[PDB]
Enzyme design. Structure first.
Site, PDB file in Angstrom:
ATOM      1  N   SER A   1      18.140 -27.636  44.609  1.00  0.00           N
ATOM      2  CA  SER A   1      18.276 -28.093  43.202  1.00  0.00           C
ATOM      3  C   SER A   1      18.367 -29.613  43.189  1.00  0.00           C
ATOM      4  O   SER A   1      17.891 -30.215  42.209  1.00  0.00           O
ATOM      5  CB  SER A   1      19.431 -27.460  42.481  1.00  0.00           C
ATOM      6  OG  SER A   1      19.127 -26.123  42.158  1.00  0.00           O
TER       7      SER A   1
ATOM      8  N   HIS B   1      16.295 -19.888  44.507  1.00  0.00           N
ATOM      9  CA  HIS B   1      17.261 -19.000  43.796  1.00  0.00           C
ATOM     10  C   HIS B   1      16.633 -17.660  43.417  1.00  0.00           C
ATOM     11  O   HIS B   1      17.298 -16.611  43.673  1.00  0.00           O
ATOM     12  CB  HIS B   1      17.799 -19.671  42.528  1.00  0.00           C
ATOM     13  CG  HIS B   1      18.609 -20.890  42.810  1.00  0.00           C
ATOM     14  ND1 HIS B   1      18.415 -22.081  42.127  1.00  0.00           N
ATOM     15  CD2 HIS B   1      19.599 -21.107  43.694  1.00  0.00           C
ATOM     16  CE1 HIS B   1      19.249 -22.987  42.583  1.00  0.00           C
ATOM     17  NE2 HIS B   1      20.037 -22.406  43.528  1.00  0.00           N
TER      18      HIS B   1
END
Lengths: 157, 157, 157, 157, 157, 157
Positions: free
Chosen positions: B129, B18
């Protein structure tokens, strides 16, 4: 980063898909180089002369877009333009994992060089040059799939 | 197109993958809004408040980056920002077809709204994630996969 | 490397596909530990105790095979066994990229720990525990998909 | 089963990826035959002489590894070595479903013959000979991607 | 719609997979045209004469199945038969996304023309002509994979 | 084979993609049963009663179409109808391998029961019920993605 993008391709031939990518990419970068490759290892349906003329023809509307012929290492070409972004296009038939590999390969060769991916419009997500080449090679109507200003160019040979 | 870009996600939690996408995409827009979705339906590990605070703390070095939490449709949040560009990342384990679909669904709901895809760094092309949640649920060291400025905040709760 | 190999999974329930992988992988190591993960987060159909008993009963013919239930990180359980090799199976419906990712996550957490992939038999290349759960939830005959020595134990509860 | 493995390939050219697979596979089997194919239908960048010499050069460190030229049926070759395991390597760009098909094909031709898959290290998961061939064919620097002892061999022609 | 189907293919050579598709498709349509393509761009192992004779031989049992040679545009061929359905076959190694693209391409060329997909039996899901061609080209036994009445035809040249 | 075909699913909710498949598949069978599964385990957004009423109302124009809700195994419901053909749709985001697997599992449970795949219209190749649920949970306009005769019934509850 936002000064210059390079959009490499065989453009065998230029499709509505490719025009969409040139439209969106040209809006984000101060300048876009469209780099038209030899694809010798590919045995292209259209010659470089035809392929450069179609893509020059099809892009006359975009004032910040320059079209060059290139027979070299993409990483090196970006170096000589001081370019930090390769523009690539993603479609339903993309070898996604191959696109990532090429992105990482180009950055290993040139540590400044990132790859950014655009989508064509939904109407064009299922267009690939390979489709367009089949329809052409099979004497079908490809006029829906390529910019109308090049269809003459492409419909003879 | 270059005035504002929106990087949406659930960020449960924000990863080093990210952070690569924020860093690269932030370079291309004058302002980048990190939009953290409630995503109630997904049952995220971390509360919307936790996820916002973590990404706020991770992006504090990027001066043109701002972090919002939102409850609604993403296509409606871009219209409120007059945002014409969504930023997404592409990873080895991405569901590539689903990213396309989401791109096209976002367009059909807001017809000014294109999607642009960036890649993380090679070292991080394998982070998701979802693999970070496994490690955290199993009390492994996730320190190598997330920004340290959130690592104190994840490990306990 | 040949002293010990660990075949981890949730085994909810153990299938004939799993039994092929135990049989072939057990041939290559002096000892094969079948490691059944709690996997609380996945909400497995069968209790950790049930899943251990089923695979124990299914592997009773393989004299170098032993069955453990574990609560922790897999990479920490291999370090406790001084295990340098994880065994996984590859199926038609495997998420291939995710297996890679898991391989690389297991390495990053335990740097002696490689992953080796086996195939089931052609007849079983189409079995997944997930299609066995559908059949069991819908009260179909799963007898053809799992080892008979567990079939009495699954069909009721 | 653990007596002998065969690792077939074009090795056009040998990469760090392939060396990783030879390292891990050679540690598990008493002996590893590296079988260097003609790949006539493939029109290989390097000749068999170059390809055998690079892979012999690159594997001198592994005492149990023998390199042979082979122009035949892999199933038959394993039969004549009394070999029960084909070694194959998996990467991010693998046609996984094609790898399984080949595994099942080889076992239908030789009912004793199982296929076992290894991973290269994360640093090498994105290396394929096809990348290495592009970089070479495009006069790029491939020195990061192949063992240094063969780079001379490969960098001329 | 149910009056006539066209099943196009190179049939290089006809496999048990293809026979399965002709069986199931011939049962649903009053008539099935099997259309045997030139695949010039493909450099086929078997000549059109061999490929038509094998598929005529292998389909003699199905009374409503006609075999023609075709060197043209599939969309046009369906037009001249007043055919509203292309029959296509799906297997584990299918480029699924490419199959959809071809389905949409054919319908854009002929707005009456839908594509319907059949499966071979599980025993045949891992058969592709490409496998069969390898086994043949490598002097292996392909007799399990093709109808026995054509094996003579195919086993010489 | 042409007497009856069964189009099973969860239809949570029925989409314009589903309606394309009903319309095309209904043309090929004398009777098409739309079989709506409870699918308790999936936790569907809409109740089994809601889902049946929605598809009933959406198919009221198709005179050979009939809508059933069922609690059991699909392979047992086809045997009760003497149904030898299951109809499924194929989409850009389909899990293609899983459709195959389900086809083969349905066969193994009912050996007369084949699976046939249809495509929606290009405009709808990107719809999934799962993207419609996101939009409905986020109070977006799903009106463009589902049949209007159900849109009053979805938007509230």
């Amino acid at each position: 980063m936002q000064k210059i993008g390079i959009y490499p391709g065989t453009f065998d031939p230029v499709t509505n898909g490719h025009i969409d990518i040139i439209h969106r990419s040209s809006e984000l970068f101060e300048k876009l180089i469209v780099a038209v490759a030899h694809s010798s290892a590919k045995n292209p349906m259209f010659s470089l002369d035809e392929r450069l003329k179609m893509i020059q023809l099809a892009t006359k509307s975009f004032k910040n877009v320059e079209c060059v012929a290139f027979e070299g290492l993409l990483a090196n070409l970006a170096k000589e333009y001081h370019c930090k972004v390769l523009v690539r296009g993603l479609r339903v038939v993309s070898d996604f994992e191959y696109e990532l590999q090429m992105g990482y390969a180009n950055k290993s060769l040139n540590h400044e060089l990132e790859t950014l991916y655009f989508m064509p419009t939904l109407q064009n997500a299922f267009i690939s040059s390979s489709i367009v080449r089949s329809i052409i090679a099979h004497k079908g109507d490809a006029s829906h799939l390529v910019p109308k200003e090049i269809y003459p160019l492409i419909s003879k040979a």
